[PDB]
Amino acid sequence: ATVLLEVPFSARGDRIPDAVAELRTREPIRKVRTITGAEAWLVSSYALCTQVLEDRRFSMKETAAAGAPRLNALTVPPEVVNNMGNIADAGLRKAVMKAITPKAPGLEQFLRDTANSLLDNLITEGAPADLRNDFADPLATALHCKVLGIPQEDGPKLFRSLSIAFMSSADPIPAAKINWDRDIEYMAGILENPNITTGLMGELSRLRKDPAYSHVSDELFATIGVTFFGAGVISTGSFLTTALISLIQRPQLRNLLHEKPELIPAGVEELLRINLSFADGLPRLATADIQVGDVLVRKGELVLVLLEGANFDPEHFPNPGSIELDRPNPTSHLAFGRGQHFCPGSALGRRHAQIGIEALLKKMPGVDLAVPIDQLVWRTRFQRRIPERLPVLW
Ligand X SMILES: O=C1N[C@@H](Cc2ccc(O)cc2)C(=O)N[C@H]1Cc1ccccc1
Q: Should residue 83 be labelled a site residue for ligand X when binding is judged by CB under 6 A?
A: yes
Q: Are strands 302-305 and 39-43 parallel, antiparallel or unpaired?
A: parallel
Q: Which is closer to a second copy, CB of 231 or CB of 376? A: 376
With residue 291 as reference, give the H or E element that holds it. Answer: strand 290-292
Binding site partner of 80, from ligand HEM, a second copy, ligand X, none, Cβ cut-off 5-8 A by kind: ligand X
158 binds ligand X (CB under 6 A): no
Residues 86-105 as x/- pattern, contact with ligand HEM by CB under 6 A? --------------x-----
Contact criterion met (CB below 8 Å) for 263 and 370:
no
x-or-dash string of contact with ligand HEM, 239-278, rule CB under 6 A: x-------------------------------------x-
| H or E segment and range at residue 282 | strand 282-286
Please report whether residue 285 would count as binding ligand X according to CB under 6 A: no
DSSP state at residue 379: P
134 or 269, CB closer to ligand HEM?
Answer: 269
How many residues does the structure list for the chain?
394
Query: Can you list the alpha helix ranges (DSSP code H) found in the chain?
Result: 18-26, 46-53, 83-89, 93-99, 107-125, 137-148, 155-159, 162-165, 174-192, 199-208, 218-248, 251-259, 264-273, 307-311, 346-363
Q: Are 32 and 304 in contact (CB under 8 A)?
A: yes
* Minimum distance from residue 386 beta carbon to a second copy (Å): 10
**With contact defined as beta carbons under 8 Å apart, do 350 and 268 qualify?**
yes
Residue pair 279/383 in contact (Cβ under 8 Å)? The answer is yes
Which of the listed partners (ligand X, a second copy, ligand HEM, none) does 7 bind, with a CB threshold of 5 to 8 Å by partner kind?
none
Does residue 60 contact residue 321 with C-beta atoms inside 8 Å?
no
What is the tally of helices (H) and strands (E) in the chain? Answer: 15, 10
Q: For residues 38 and 73, which CB has a smaller minimum distance to ligand X in the complex? A: 73
Kindly write out the interface string for residues 241-270 of this chain, putting x where it contacts ligand X by CB under 6 A and - elsewhere.
------------------------------
Binding partner of 349, given ligand HEM, ligand X, a second copy, none, CB within 5-8 angstroms per partner class: ligand HEM
Burial of 89-114, coded b for 16+ CB within 10 Å and e otherwise, reads: ebebeebbeebbebebeebeebbeeb
Residue nearest to ligand HEM (CB): 345
At its nearest, how many Å lie between ligand X and the CB of residue 143? 16
Shortest reach from residue 387's CB to ligand HEM, in Å: 17
Q: If binding is defined by CB under 6 A, does position 230 make contact with ligand X?
A: yes
Q: What are phi and psi of 32, to 5 degrees?
A: -140, 170
Q: Which residues bind ligand HEM (CB under 6 A)?
A: 60, 83-84, 100, 227-228, 231-232, 235-236, 239, 277, 282, 335-337, 341, 343-345, 348-349
Q: Which residues bind ligand X (CB under 6 A)?
A: 75-76, 80-81, 83, 165, 227, 230-231
Binding site feature residues for substrate: 75, 83-84, 235, 299, 383
